[PDB]
Design a protein around this ligand. Structure first.
Ligand SMILES: Nc1ncnc2c1ncn2[C@@H]1O[C@H](COP(=O)(O)OP(=O)(O)OP(=O)(O)O)[C@@H](O)[C@H]1O
Ligand SMILES: Nc1ncnc2c1ncn2[C@@H]1O[C@H](COP(=O)(O)OP(=O)(O)OP(=O)(O)O)[C@@H](O)[C@H]1O
Ligand SMILES: [Mg+2]
Ligand SMILES: [Mg+2]
Lengths: 592, 120, 240
């Protein structure tokens, strides 16, 4: 590339000196000059006609002269920024000399160089101020000409996508302005520890403008940024991914024995999905996934296809770590010697084979761990819970393998015979073994139930639990004990109903939870019935919790990493990789 | 495989079932008992097979420190799952320990236990 | 009063918090523990003041007869009120007692407990639960003895604990009898644990900040300050 940019005013001999600044000559030269007639293009034309190989051009701003007015200044700034964007080389930053012109366009060009990158911002000066070509030729021969250099300037590497979004606009007027950077500059402080919620310390290396744009409120137009961000999912049920659509159809087709499957059953469609305008009961939500689940994944082929499709969706959503809950007893039948253990073994083997295959090809891969969900309902008998706990404890002892059981889950419970306050004797074994414990303590459960889950079971993560506001002691214990909280904005938004739900005034407490310091994480619950992956699940927070910031999203990701049931070495490696990827994407996503 | 092969030839064989051993160490890793119990339970889900897990064994030294009066909570699950419990209490068989094994543990078999004449 | 008068003149000050030691006597008045607990709870209702009690300490002899396997009923109330619990199980600390302190007592930070190397499951549980361990290098070096102590080849487990990922803090226990302040306690790691790096000292500071019994907003304010001060002192030391 090696493109030089200069601003020419009354003086015209600065351009040859800027050309001679490099010790091997330039390759392309473009000069932006004002519409004033003082500038003489004849000298530049005759100087650059001696070297046809280099490229020369001249741009004049129509309707501007001497830039003595606020409207004139803003129009000149906009036109100069557009010209700078147009002549950016595709890969290499361009050199820029701003000696020519009055302090106005000089300062504007320096600001543009800071904003859009500049391989070398340099000045040219001489003792006698030469005018003719012979004068500065003799000056450079003697060495009088000095090339002031203030150092390389990386600029902010992602601002050129504006060029892809802003047309050439060769013929335009004063209306066509792009104050998309001045808005953040005004919004610096126009709104305590928010600077210190800085996760992934390499964000400190980021440009100041990028650090600022991180602090601006999240907007619905950041779908690309959210999708490109590596994410962590901790609440993603396996049985609710291929509920309906093409994925369910191909899962059904890939069954080993499709004769026994029930393809006639279809789930009723709720109008307005996924942003339904009416509240949905938990029982109806569970029934909505009856197309998939226990009744379908009994055969090996359907289960393997469903797991492969779920992993494909996970790696397509840039999720770099996910914990999937599976219930082996739902997919186990003794007719074909398919026990719960063999079902869990098949799921684990498929996940580890997919992970190893993806990693061998040196592509982006999603490390996946499994939670054995121990739903304590059954037909009123607790042998199911003991069987699930024993299965998880034995599944830990596999040891070798990438994907492994990390913890258990408790769900499918209401109260009394199902309350968690009467199982700690069983849970002594699972705690001694080393498994983690996660609770589904939502469904408007009493705060005493949450207390029992936190203390009696020593649970490390609580599902949903949106009623923490009504119990200040519960919030104090949760924050002080560093107990993570997982919520699904789409699932809890449809099931319960939060603003902007019509005829609903309750607000999502995610912003308040983040302000209070709860280790809150964002998840997907069931991908299929909810019909929204992690990307839109995070994007909806711009409406569910207005006023949230991108820095809060990165804090969400950091909390998800911190509260995951992983070994310390793996957690450190994951944190390092996540920080590097986040820095890279943020450095190449402020372009738009 | 051995049992089926013997049955195919239509001769005398020996049907065999397996009891896991809940060995006691108290030299660290006290969760071993639980692990063993869990193992037994999940093996019951094999379902098929002429040979199958039929219960657990309470092997190990059975002095006062290692009595069966502390582990009813762990054994509630193994009793719920249908396994039979055998107590390997041999020497230093205090009558209180055997009573606890019989009643608290709901054991259906006692190993050795040659001191029953002392406690009518 | 001291903290307020130090803040008024706008200088460096040391924010402090209180811990009520619920030690064990066994020479009578066995209710003392309960009394201490009650006292702590009542004093939490002070509300105001930059200095307030944030937890209790389970000091005293740590034999089996007075282990943490009897006091769950008493400690349910202190857990409910909102006081953190620190276990002083460092002497004759059987792994069962430490496990009971972690789970039955819901201890948020252990005291000493230098024998975690032998028990892998206990160390794994401590690492996973993110519970801190406070070790004073000078006190443990004088009492237990570690290299380069003559006729003592035992290695201090601080470096291994840090490598494993435990949240380990360095303290003084008693400034008087030990005769060494916090700076000397950190300095002694040069020969107590060979190979420890300065970044590991910063890790120790971060762990001590994280495991401290403080409110979240105060914790983040402290973390921001600490970031500024550490940056300043590191820059000054490197430039000079
Ligand atoms: N599950 C079993 N366990 C032990 N013995 C069995 C079992 N099933 C069958 N048997 C016995 O094995 C024997 C097979 O041998 P056989 O058919 O010649 O009968 P037999 O007249 O008793 O002569 P033999 O001495 O060979 O047993 C049968 O007698 C049968 O009663
Ligand atoms: N509770 C505290 N205890 C100790 N230091 C504190 C405390 N709170 C704030 N500080 C820090 O004390 C310093 C007050 O002095 P100042 O505002 O001049 O900052 P400074 O540039 O570091 O200069 P100085 O040497 O005076 O600290 C602040 O940096 C502040 O972050
Ligand atoms: Mg769920
Ligand atoms: Mg002490």
């Amino acid at each position: 590339s090696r493109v030089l940019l200069c601003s020419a005013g009354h003086s015209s001999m600065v351009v040859p000196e800027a050309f001679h600044a490099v010790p091997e000559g330039f390759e392309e030269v473009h000069v932006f000059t004002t519409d004033s007639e003082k500038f003489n293009p004849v000298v530049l034309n005759d100087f650059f006609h001696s070297l046809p190989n280099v490229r020369f051009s001249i741009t004049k701003c129509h309707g501007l002269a001497d830039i003595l007015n606020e409207r004139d200044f803003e129009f000149y700034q906009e036109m100069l920024w557009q010209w700078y964007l147009t002549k950016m080389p595709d890969n290499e930053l361009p050199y820029v000399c701003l000696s020519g012109g009055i302090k106005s366009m000089s300062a504007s060009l320096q600001k543009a160089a800071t904003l859009f990158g500049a391989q070398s911002v340099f000045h040219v000066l001489a003792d006698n101020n030469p005018r003719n070509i012979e004068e500065m030729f003799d000056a450079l021969q003697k060495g009088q000409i000095h090339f002031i250099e203030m150092g390389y300037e990386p600029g902010w590497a992602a601002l050129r996508r504006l060029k892809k979004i802003l047309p050439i606009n060769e013929g335009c007027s004063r209306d066509n302005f792009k104050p998309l950077i001045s808005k953040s500059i005004e919004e610096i402080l126009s709104n305590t520890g928010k600077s210190n919620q800085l996760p992934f310390p390499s964000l400190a290396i980021l440009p100041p403008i990028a650090q600022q744009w991180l602090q601006l409120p999240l907007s619905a137009n950041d779908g690309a940024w959210i999708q490109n961000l590596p994410k962590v999912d901790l609440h993603c049920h396996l049985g609710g991914f291929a509920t309906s659509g093409s994925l369910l159809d191909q899962v059904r087709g890939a069954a080993s024995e499709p004769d026994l499957i029930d393809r006639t059953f279809s789930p009723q469609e709720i109008a307005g999905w996924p942003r339904s305008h009416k509240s949905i009961s938990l029982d109806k939500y569970m029934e909505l996934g009856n197309a998939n689940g226990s009744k379908l994944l009994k055969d090996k082929g359907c289960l393997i296809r469903q797991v492969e499709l779920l992993y494909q969706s996970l790696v397509n959503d840039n999720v770099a770590y996910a914990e999937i809950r599976c219930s082996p007893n739902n997919y186990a039948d003794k007719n074909k010697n398919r026990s719960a253990w063999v079902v869990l073994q098949d799921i684990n083997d498929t996940f580890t084979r997919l992970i190893t295959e993806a990693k061998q090809k040196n592509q982006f891969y999603c490390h996946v761990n499994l939670l054995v969900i121990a739903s304590r309902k059954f037909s009123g008998d607790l042998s199911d819970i003991s069987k699930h706990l024993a299965l998880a404890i034995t599944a830990m002892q596999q040891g070798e393998g990438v994907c492994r059981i990390v913890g258990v889950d408790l769900a499918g419970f209401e109260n009394k015979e199902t309350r968690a306050s009467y199982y700690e004797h069983d849970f002594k074994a699972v705690h001694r073994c080393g498994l983690a414990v996660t609770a589904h303590a939502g469904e408007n459960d009493d705060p005493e139930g949450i207390w029992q889950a936190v203390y009696s079971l020593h649970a490390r993560r609580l599902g949903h639990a949106l009623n923490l506001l009504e119990a200040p002691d519960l919030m104090r214990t949760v924050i002080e004990r560093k107990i993570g909280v997982e919520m699904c904005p789409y699932a809890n938004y449809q099931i319960k109903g939060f603003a902007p739900m019509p005829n609903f005034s309750a607000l999502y407490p995610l912003k308040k939870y983040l302000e209070a310091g709860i280790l809150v994480s964002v998840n997907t619950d069931n991908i299929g019935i909810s019909g929204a992956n992690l990307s839109e699940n995070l994007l909806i927070l711009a409406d569910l919790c207005p006023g949230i910031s991108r820095m809060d999203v990165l804090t969400i990701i950091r909390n998800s990493i911190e509260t995951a049931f992983i070994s310390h070495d793996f957690r450190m490696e994951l944190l390092k990789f996540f920080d590097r990827k986040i820095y890279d994407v943020c450095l190449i996503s402020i372009k738009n």
